[PDB]
Amino acid sequence: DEFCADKLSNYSCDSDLEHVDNPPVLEDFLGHQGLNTDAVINNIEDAVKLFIGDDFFEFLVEESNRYYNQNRNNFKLSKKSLKWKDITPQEMKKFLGLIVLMGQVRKDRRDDYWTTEPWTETPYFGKTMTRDRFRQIWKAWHFNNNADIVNESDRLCKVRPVLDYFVPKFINIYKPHQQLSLDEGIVPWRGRLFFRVYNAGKIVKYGILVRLLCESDTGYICNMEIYCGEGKRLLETIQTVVSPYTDSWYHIYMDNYYNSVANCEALMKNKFRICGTIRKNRGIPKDFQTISLKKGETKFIRKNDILLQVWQSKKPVYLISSIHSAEMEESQNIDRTSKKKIVKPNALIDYNKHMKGVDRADQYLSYYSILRRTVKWTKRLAMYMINCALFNSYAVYKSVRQRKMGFKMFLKQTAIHWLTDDIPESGMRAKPPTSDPPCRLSMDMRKHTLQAIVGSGKKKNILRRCRVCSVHKLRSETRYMCKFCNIPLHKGACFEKYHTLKNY
Amino acid sequence: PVLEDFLGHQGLNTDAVINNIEDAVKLFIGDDFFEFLVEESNRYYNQNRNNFKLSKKSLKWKDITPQEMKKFLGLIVLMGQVRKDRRDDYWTTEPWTETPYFGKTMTRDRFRQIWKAWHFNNNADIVNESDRLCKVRPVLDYFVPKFINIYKPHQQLSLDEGIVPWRGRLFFRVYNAGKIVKYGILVRLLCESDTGYICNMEIYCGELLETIQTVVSPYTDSWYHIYMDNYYNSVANCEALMKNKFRICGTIDFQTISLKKGETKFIRKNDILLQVWQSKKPVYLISSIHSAEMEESQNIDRTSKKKIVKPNALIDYNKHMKGVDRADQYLSYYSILRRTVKWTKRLAMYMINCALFNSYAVYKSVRQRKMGFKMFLKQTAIHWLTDDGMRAKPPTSDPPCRLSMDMRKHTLQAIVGSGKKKNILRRCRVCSVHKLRSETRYMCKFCNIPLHKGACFEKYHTLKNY
DNA sequence: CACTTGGATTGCGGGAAACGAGTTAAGTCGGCTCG
DNA sequence: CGAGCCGACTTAACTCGTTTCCCGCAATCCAAGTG
Ligand SMILES: [Zn+2]
Ligand SMILES: [Zn+2]
Ligand SMILES: [Zn+2]
Ligand SMILES: [Zn+2]
């Protein structure tokens, strides 16, 4: 349904590609920054504006008009109208707002929202933009220069400038809690880029590698990086991720598959503490590689302040930590045969608590279901990024002013706001008839108002012949005259026609 | 070596005039179904008339008549075309997510009063509830016999369980590790392997060969081939099933412990092949439908060779076992869904979807045209909502489009009354926000808001606050 | 023994849609006038 | 030498009371995701 011009969008891709004890750390520093914001919010609209706003729209509008012109030759297929260069920021808000709004009423195709079919009608869309205008903008929705990069068949730089817009805001609006975590999220949308072979764990993901750093209690996104490289940059996994957060003693909980003991020193150099799983083909002392435990038994070894522990489950469970002592404690778990509960290393219990109630932004991706089937690669990625920005706006809103809402309502209200244009810009002849004024076709409801006619004779409730009716040689009287220009007019259509039409 | 060919018949067993949607559906669902639902719904409500605390301003109860029940289902089915997340938000008056059609079909409270009464059994009259399913029993009874006598399946059949998801109080909470639903009602059913047509049913209910033989019962004495998964067959079952003239193929003599990769050995006894192949695990194959052979086939998956050599039995097994999912996978997520507390409603809804599915399969058998199930369902809802003096809604919030200054769109039209008189006035929206009752018969044609001439109309479009 | 959330499920009530009784505001048309 | 103002007559917008339901919130109790 769409065409590509640069041989990168939707190219070079295919289908179907889917020392025998352990002290706790005592040198636990809390010398960090406040868990707060750098901005003023009174309501939902103010919160949204910190991440998404008019400058976002200017960017989208400028690029959209440029793209269409460059490729205008295959629009020969035609359109009802061609003001395609005339997209302005106010139209683009409507374009985006309608897409977000669609998640509240979910239909199967984009083309079924703009319908006239009375059975499943949703009239608001029809009253906001026309069907063809939306499609024309859709084809023209584009995110980049399209003529600056000629040196390589990159297929990344195409969405790069969108990400560049949002990243500094995730960093400068809000700062996170002592505990952070890493993951790899993303939408199940049939994208076209496959690097599955380099994963270090996963959430169903499309297109490119995506790295998230999130606050452990709230789900706020602290950083994001995409397509870090094809496995070449996934080791030293967090070095490009937590860079702006160094020296803050954040504790990082992770489950990446490429951690190591050696890696832990790097984290200490940058003042981070970690907890996560460890692979066996790693710098694990050999004497701990050949062990046997009874179910529920643990073994602990340490070197320096790094604890390597094994708890025995169906699988031995390995955990590496630079935070906890090797102590056992009752967990909340109950065995099917025992109400006495199961005792586990405190580190494991703590680890699991901080890996949940996180990455809430990804949890809501199912909302934008319309973006799955027939979408160009770059549109899907840009939408992920917009959703992330809305999520962060919500989290801040809620954290600054405690109220109960939910992300779902935050989004509905935001869409209504964007879609609303609430910004304002004496003789025998009782009266000599006149010619039609030059202001006749000035379209303004603030000026062409209706008032009753007041006479000069004994009877003030005077009626006069309508000018429009005079044109057709009809005699019909009215009590009303246009106030702007003194022409007697009937109420209803004659007043509308006189001020609206070139003739009458 | 199957030497008896096939003694069945295929396709419609009835005079189904398949030239439209309506005549495909009525075979399974129709007016007598609704007569059943109405009779029980009116008895249920009145028999339990006390303890309702009906409020003062709601509508008074009126008994349910057949059209309302047809509307009732039609609206529920449409909710699958347009999805909203709360049952009562379909009646919202907010202009941006409005779906006005529902509002014009029946009111919110009427829908809630019918919903409550959508009952399936006269438990008040018959109290001999020894049967945990006695409350859905007549629903199950209504639909299954039709599946059997409308259409006959071709030679290859398969057996599996249907799924009705449910985390609340139920007959059982047993989960079979080889099944796809963690919890809910499991249904035992046969279907035709190519179309998914559902042929016969039983409900996992109450608490091997006794049920295998029972479900297949209407299909004995004709040489049907039945394909089975890990938990339905046995060697002994095969022997028994042969006595009723049908053949079995499926999965489930220690020598098989010996190992070989690539081509492997079989044990063959008494015309039953008991071959064991090896993949990640020993692959057991039992068959009374073909001779032993091993040959290549084109895999869907990428493989080391263009084609991979496998026991012929696996080649056929993995082509016929699709019938089970196409038979109802749609029905697990399309409408007639709830998070209700009545298990009876969830189960009854599953049964309704089976009937709609079978209607679709029949339709396609006759016509060469290809359309999905989804369109069959949408059109059905349209038909049921078609008719084989409602009050105007009050305003609740002022539309976001009122400030758009286009004098071609905003115009005064006279109100047209839905009641006895066409002329009827309404409260002026510009005056009632100051609690001044005053009445008018002119309205903005684009916005649907009542206004007075001039002084009110101008303010409503021009002023941010009025 | 859950954690968390929000959709069913339960009602209560501010307000106005509808109909008819009973007084007002704007229209039809004439036959005389000033352009 | 062209088309209207005062007056006497008809319809069409407005109060007011009164019954009857509209959907919008607001309060409890579990069923979905996965310790
Ligand atoms: Zn004017
Ligand atoms: Zn006129
Ligand atoms: Zn209007
Ligand atoms: Zn008014």
Side-chain angles (χ1 to χ4, degrees), chain B residues 428-432 436 438-440 450-453 455-457:
Chain B
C428 177
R429 178 63 180 168
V430 170
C431 304
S432 101
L436 303 175
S438 52
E439 301 187 32
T440 171
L451 298 165
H452 293 113
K453 57 183 180 278
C456 296
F457 187 102

Side-chain angles (χ1 to χ4, degrees), chain A residues 437 439-440 442 447-449 482-487 489 495 498-499:
Chain A
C439 70
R440 186 177 72 81
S442 181
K447 300 298 185 181
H448 295 289
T449 60
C482 180
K483 186 171 184 177
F484 191 81
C485 57
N486 296 319
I487 301 172
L489 294 166
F495 187 101
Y498 186 80
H499 296 89

Side-chain angles (χ1 to χ4, degrees), chain A residues 332 334 428-429 463 475-480 491:
Chain A
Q332 69 275 37
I334 301 297
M428 290 302 291
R429 288 180 279 172
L463 303 174
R475 179 181 179 181
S476 180
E477 299 177 6
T478 180
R479 180 61 189 280
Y480 297 90
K491 72 195 191 298

